[PDB]
């Protein structure tokens, strides 16, 4: 119906036009009579008739006098619904300011009037004058004064000098302010000045002035002269029991405001003293700006119960405003709620529903069907029959739910599967029967969980629920391609028992014709369930075409597998059943079934699987007992050996040989080894003692213990759980996070000691409270992520670009964390994938990577691939389908319209319930040092050096003169398998391209020594090194030869600051060595804290550590990789010590020492040094004054910052780092997430941009303009001969992206309501509601789902 929404300021004339009257009496209603007042807060002639088609005086009450007003009260007789929109006003006597524009931080007036907010507040609260219309006076026109500064200066000028002390003063200042003149003056000032903070203030002021002059607003409207009022019925006021009425806080606010206004009018009429009227004006200002936003001024006044009062701003902000409570999520009709219950008989596509619930939900459909047949002629008869619930209504209820699905919903909703569609079947009861195979996706246990049910109610809705939200249409999770219908513990335990074959049982060695005969023989009891029998199977194999070739063959399998074969469809082979059929086994079986046979038979296959599993687990009789859990007989001797070891360790400690730390470490490792040994013993015990004679002596087999069947099959029990159960619990934790030296030498089956149980519960309460605290942070993160999301949909089919990202399997740390396949599966290649064979186009561009495609790619041994990405897509206000990839829930390419952002945010926030908040895992919780630089290798390969800069020593090894050097292992096929960071001065015992085996160390480095190793042999001298000025002599004691110490910039006086100690590699003649290739003198300028043990004039070696500069290594820096880690990563917050990079290349030097901190200068050979920087004097310097490094290289060793990464490495490096970090954090826990989600998240995260040079564009250089907008403007300018612009992408934290959006309603729905509302109002912004959330807040179709096409049809109209 209507187009975009426009927001701007409210002119007083506009308010008066809105007003249908003025409230003057502060009374609402009367005590004896409930009729409203004449012109009070609740009026009739101002707002409307309190009753329908009935006036206040009762004169015009018929339906024929409607449309006219009365002669005494003058109330237009109409419906009371008109009271929902009619408003009045209050004529304020002393114009006041708006607390929103005054407490915005930064406030609008504080920046517009170039006046500090402190002085404006002083003027507003009537305690200091401000002058106006200076002119010929000596004072400045905008200067402020106090009472004394006014009384002493009044005698100088009293006719032309005037200074008001109210909001009228700033109102007149606004009215007496020019727009074009000030704009031109500030533009000239910005063009003439050269500063950073001043230029930022000037550009903010000029942007503010441009927003004023461009939009249809006027500054003087900020001073509220008339006050709009809230319609009466919208004001909460209802007759409570008795004379008291339930009122609202806004009622009291308006009451007090009207009272203070009337008192001020009375005081002005009697010509009260100046102090009295100024105090009354201050009180009226307090009243009005508490009505606007109570508590913002500082004093949160209370009305009743001594509680903070509710103002108008409170009704919008927070989790209780209109946006969060009444606009985004509203309560719906035709809904119900009930506790869940296991339904084991219903099919996967359907569900159960209580009879009374189904009756109460579908009352209109029942009424319609009763009126259809000759059963009920009116609605009253049908209602009475439904209330009576005769025998004639139940069949109607069964008919209306014949094919009418409903929606089941879990209370905490994480991903798309939080709401599913199901066909209901009526059941007698008060509980909702649910399918067992979907609750796992619901994450809903049956311990008392309550879920909700909703009705589609519309043909379109029913068809959508049957087509999209149905359970059958959702079998792959949107996060990972893994099927979310993986079987649960009961069915998998039943199947494992059915397939776990023994050695001897009833009917071992016989022959069976088919699976039906096997089932007959089993149910007859003449044979067992699991026994090796030779049967004949008749399997079917899918040929190249749609043919199913049949082959009959004699197999030797267990009776259980043969019986279960009657369930699997014909397409699958027999090798998938001829297994133990564990959890992973049945999961891969279902996956292969869905892959080969599609979706239609997979549903019934899973249903039959679940049915047979339940039936055979019931028939089996699986049960855990006391005798089932066995204790290892040799556990006692292991415990005694462990206690003897700890006793001898304590004896050694008492002997004074070993200290406390090493004693604790030895005790901990001894107990860990003992626990591992006893766990292995328990496992090998639980596996043995299962011997059965089959015409022999002993045929030891797989153990048939029930607890082992439950654990090994992966149904419910894991290895660690059964270890804690049967074996010793092991070690526990103390409050700080350390490990107590006294372990728990008992188990659960055996009696647990009191102190042991106390330590156990102390350790467990931490993990228990962990999730209870972390659920709130996870919900907050999900909300932030979805608010950043939902601003993009698939609006194009192709962008027409070729840029992407170089995806490669990460191999950092161990061998490999994940291959390339899973990182490219479901995507489209940008360029031609180059096989190791030169000039190969085996994978053409613009092609989707299917299963066979990635299989062939892995077969061809491809190391990396340039794959299309979302950050590279050029689609405006959305993304294209040709850049996202597969849907991850459908077996085809992504369609057009589906909101990728919402599903991405959901898939990212779902594992939040499985992450951690805080733990002792701080990276080096055990030990970490640079002495670990002894790098070994597992497999055999050739060595490859990245960033090659190294030389060879006289000892036979290779020394590295750089830090960015990287060691890689090329395998026999050509790919990389091992990657490691080569430290500075590593002892590379190998060479580049050399074939080395696995299991040997190739390099190593000193832990606490920064090497200044040379490059070529020569003679060393004390060049530019004078004793007593730059160095000191601290003699050694145990080394014979003493060490020359160098002081740092903290202890060295000013006498040696201009002298830097250096080392000059000279020859015997006197001339220094020349670096081979260049024409630069070879010298090493050593910084402070240098320990030079080498003498003078001695023949130095090629690459020998001369000055042993001690580093600050030995501490941990791995910030806890929990939910706070990913929160801070997405928020793009800077770490405590940000690892600074190199802005420009070239040499570096130190200039002005102690300019508050250390200084640095970067001078390249190409350009100048236009950028200075401050560096703390407590951070070590990796690069020295003589070393030349490329831009973007680390200087301060520590955690990096994403801002510098993006601004010095491009758009692809920063997103690669982000995705790698977040995937590592998620895989540390064990949860898998496709990279497309985080990719689109970061793409949305860098939506903003800035300008460097305006050029021919209309955007100023100091304006943070949107990326796609300036991009399309640059495109338009490229269509002509003018230069577009100089755009620079800047990264911000996720909370800032939801605010710096062209749509203001989308930001108003988020936090920070008042500031964004004021910013949109002052600029007269108008948003085209182009998105999803705004389309909800307005309440229309969404341009993402089935209605997206509708929106397209709306775009073709205009």
């Amino acid at each position: 119906e209507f187009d975009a929404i426009k927001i701007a300021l409210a002119s007083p004339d506009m308010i008066r036009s809105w007003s249908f009257g003025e409230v003057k009496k502060p009374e609402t209603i009367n005590y004896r009579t409930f009729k409203p007042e004449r012109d009070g807060l609740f009026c009739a002639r101002i707002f409307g008739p309190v009753k329908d088609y009935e006036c206040l005086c009762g004169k015009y009450k018929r339906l024929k006098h409607r449309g006219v007003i009365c002669e005494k009260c003058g109330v237009e007789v109409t419906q009371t619904k008109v009271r929902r929109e009619r408003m009045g006003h209050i004529e304020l006597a002393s114009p006041t300011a708006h607390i929103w524009f005054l407490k915005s931080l930064p406030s609008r007036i504080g920046l517009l009037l170039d006046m500090p907010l402190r002085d404006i507040e002083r003027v507003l609260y009537f305690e200091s004058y401000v002058v106006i219309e200076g002119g010929m006076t000596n004072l400045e026109r905008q200067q402020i004064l106090t009472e004394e500064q006014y009384l002493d200066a009044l005698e100088e000028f009293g006719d032309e000098f005037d200074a008001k002390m109210g909001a009228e003063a700033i109102q007149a200042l606004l009215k007496s302010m020019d727009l074009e003149q000030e704009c031109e003056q500030l533009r000239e000032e910005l063009n003439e000045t050269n500063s950073e903070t001043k230029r930022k203030k000037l550009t903010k002021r000029i942007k503010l002035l441009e927003a004023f002059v461009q939009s249809g607003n006027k500054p003087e409207w900020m001073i509220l002269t008339v006050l709009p009022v809230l319609p009466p019925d919208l004001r909460p006021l209802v007759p409570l029991d008795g004379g008291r009425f339930a009122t609202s806080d806004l009622n009291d606010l308006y009451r007090r405001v009207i009272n203070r206004n009337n008192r001020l009018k009375r005081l002005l009429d009697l010509a009260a003293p100046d102090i009295i009227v100024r105090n009354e004006k201050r009180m009226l200002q307090e009243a009005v700006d508490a009505l606007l936003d109570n508590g913002r001024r500082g004093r949160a006044i209370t009305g009743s119960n001594k509680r903070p009062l509710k103002s108008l701003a409170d009704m919008i902000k927070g989790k209780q405003g209109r946006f969060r409570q009444n606009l985004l999520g509203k309560r719906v009709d035709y809904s119900g709620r009930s506790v869940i219950t296991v339904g084991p008989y219903l099919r996967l596509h359907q569900c159960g529903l209580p009879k009374k619930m189904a009756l109460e939900l579908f009352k209109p459909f029942i009424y319609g069907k009763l009126e259809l047949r000759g059963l009920a002629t009116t609605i009253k008869a049908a209602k009475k029959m439904v209330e009576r619930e005769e025998a004639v209504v139940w069949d109607i209820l069964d008919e209306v739910i014949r094919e009418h699905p409903v929606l089941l919903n879990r209370a905490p909703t994480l991903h798309r599967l939080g709401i599913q569609a199901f066909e209901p079947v009526l059941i007698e009861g008060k509980a909702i029967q649910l399918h067992p195979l979907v609750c796992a996706a619901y994450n809903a246990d049956f311990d008392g969980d309550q879920m909700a049910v909703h009705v589609p109610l519309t043909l379109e809705a029913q068809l959508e629920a049957r087509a999209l939200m149905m359970s059958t249409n959702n079998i792959l999770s949107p996060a990972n391609g893994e099927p979310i219908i993986v079987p649960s513990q009961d069915v998998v335990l039943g199947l494992y028992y059915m397939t776990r074959d023994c050695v001897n049982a009833k009917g071992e060695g016989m022959v069976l014709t088919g699976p039906k005969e096997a089932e007959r023989l089993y149910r007859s009891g003449l044979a067992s369930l699991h026994a090796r029998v030779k049967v004949r199977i008749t399997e079917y194999e899918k040929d190249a075409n749609g043919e199913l070739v049949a082959k009959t063959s004699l197999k030797d399998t267990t009776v259980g597998r043969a019986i279960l074969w009657m369930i699997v469809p014909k397409g699958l082979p027999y090798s998938i059943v001829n297994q133990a059929l564990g959890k992973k086994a049945i999961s891969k079986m279902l996956n292969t079934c869905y892959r080969i046979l599609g979706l239609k038979p997979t549903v019934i296959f899973a249903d039959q699987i679940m049915y047979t599993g339940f039936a055979y687990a019931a028939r089996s009789g699986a049960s855990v007992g006391i005798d089932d859990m066995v204790i290892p007989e040799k556990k006692h001797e292991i415990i005694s050996e462990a206690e003897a070891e700890v006793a001898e360790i304590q004896e050694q400690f008492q002997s004074g040989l070993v200290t406390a730390g090493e004693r604790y470490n030895k005790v901990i490792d001894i107990w860990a080894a003992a626990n591992d040994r006893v766990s292995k013993a328990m496992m090998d015990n639980l596996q043995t003692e299962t011997v059965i004679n089959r015409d022999g002596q002993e045929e030891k087999q797989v153990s048939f213990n029930s607890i082992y069947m439950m654990a090994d099959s992966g149904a419910r029990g894991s290895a660690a759980q059964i270890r804690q159960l049967a074996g010793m619990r092991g070690l526990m934790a103390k409050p700080d996070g350390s490990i107590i030296e006294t372990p728990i030498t008992a188990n659960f089956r055996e009696g647990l000691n009191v102190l042991q149980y106390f330590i156990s519960t102390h350790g467990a309460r931490k993990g228990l409270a962990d999730t209870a605290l972390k659920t709130a942070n996870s919900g907050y993160l999900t909300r932030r992520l979805v608010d950043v999301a939902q601003d993009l949909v698939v609006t194009e089919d192709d962008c027409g670009t070729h840029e992407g990202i170089m995806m490669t399997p990460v191999i950092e740390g161990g061998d490999v964390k994940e291959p390339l396949r899973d990182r490219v599966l479901g995507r489209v290649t940008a360029e031609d994938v180059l096989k190791p064979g030169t000039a190969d186009i085996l994978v053409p561009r613009n092609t989707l990577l299917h299963e066979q495609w990635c299989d062939l790619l892995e077969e061809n041994s491809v190391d990396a691939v340039k794959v299309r990405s979302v950050v590279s897509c050029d689609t405006d206000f959305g993304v294209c389908a040709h850049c996202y990839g597969r849907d991850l829930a459908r077996g085809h390419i992504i369609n057009k319209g589906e909101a990728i952002g919402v599903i991405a945010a959901q898939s990212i926030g779902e594992p939040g319930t499985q992450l951690t908040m805080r733990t002792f895992h701080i990276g080096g919780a055990a030990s970490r040092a640079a002495a670990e630089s002894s790098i070994q290798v597992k497999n055999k390969g050739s060595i490859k050096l990245s960033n090659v800069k190294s030389v060879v020593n006289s000892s036979g090894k290779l020394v590295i003169t750089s830090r960015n050097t990287e060691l890689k292992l090329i395998d026999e096929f050509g790919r990389t398998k091992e990657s490691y960071k080569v430290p500075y001065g590593a002892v590379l015992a190998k060479g580049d391209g050399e074939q080395v085996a696995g299991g040997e160390t190739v390099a190593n480095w000193d832990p606490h020594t920064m090497p200044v190793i040379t490059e070529v042999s020569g003679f060393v001298r004390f060049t530019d090194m004078i004793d007593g000025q730059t160095i000191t002599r601290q003699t050694d004691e145990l080394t014979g030869l003493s060490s020359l110490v160098v002081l740092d910039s903290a202890e060295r006086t000013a006498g040696g600051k201009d002298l830097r100690p250096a080392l000059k590699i000279v020859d015997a003649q006197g001339n220094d060595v020349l670096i081979p290739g260049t024409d630069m003198p070879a010298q090493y300028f050593l910084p402070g804290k240098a320990i030079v043990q080498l003498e003078d004039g001695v023949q130095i070696s090629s690459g020998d550590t001369l000055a042993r500069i001690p580093q600050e290594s030995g501490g941990t820096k791995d910030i806890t990789g929990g939910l706070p880690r990913v929160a801070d990563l997405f928020e793009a917050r800077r770490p405590k010590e940000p690892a600074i990079l190199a802005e420009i290349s070239g040499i570096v030097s130190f200039g002005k020492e102690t300019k508050g901190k250390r200084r640095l200068v970067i001078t390249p050979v190409d350009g100048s040094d236009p950028y200075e920087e401050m560096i703390p004097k407590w951070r070590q310097l990796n690069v020295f004054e003589g070393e030349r490094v490329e831009r973007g290289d680390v200087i301060s060793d520590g955690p990096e910052a994403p801002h510098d990464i993006l601004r010095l490495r491009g758009v692809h490096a920063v997103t690669r780092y982000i995705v790698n970090e977040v995937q590592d954090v998620y895989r540390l826990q064990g949860v898998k997430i496709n990279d497309k989600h985080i990719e689109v998240i970061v793409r949305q995260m860098l939506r903003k941009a800035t300008i460097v040079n305006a050029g021919s564009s209309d955007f100023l250089e100091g304006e943070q303009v949107e990326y796609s907008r300036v991009k399309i403007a640059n495109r338009e300018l490229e269509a002509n001969g003018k230069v577009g612009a100089t755009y620079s992408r800047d990264l911000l934290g996720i909370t800032k992206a939801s605010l710096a959006t062209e749509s203001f309603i989308s930001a108003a729905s988020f936090q920070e309501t008042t500031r964004v509302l004021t910013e949109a109002a002052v600029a007269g912004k108008r948003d085209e509601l182009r998105g999803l959330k705004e389309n909800v807040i307005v309440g229309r179709l969404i341009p993402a789902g089935t209605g997206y096409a509708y929106h397209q049809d709306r775009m073709r109209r205009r």
Binding site: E403, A467, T472, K600, K896, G1345, T1346, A1349
Partner: protein
């Protein structure tokens, strides 16, 4: 009855246009007063619409052609 709609996704380009044309067919069958081209088995309008779509004789182009034809018939009768 109907349990899966994968074959419909095979026959139509995607799921959104599929559900749109199914809703159009359901509106034509329920309130439009049109007869189902496939004999029903005590099923609602949605199920028979999905079945007739799966049989391949009804889609968006066919529905537009039928709408144009009924319009032409209206005008021919108005003569």
């Amino acid at each position: 009855a109907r349990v899966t709609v994968q074959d419909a996704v095979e026959k139509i380009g995607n799921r959104f246009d599929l559900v749109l044309v199914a809703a159009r067919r359901a509106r034509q069958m329920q309130v439009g007063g049109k007869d189902p081209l496939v004999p029903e088995e005590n099923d609602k309008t949605t199920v028979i619409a999905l079945r007739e779509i799966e049989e391949g004789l009804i889609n968006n182009q066919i529905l537009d052609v039928r709408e144009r034809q009924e319009q032409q018939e209206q005008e021919a009768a108005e003569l």
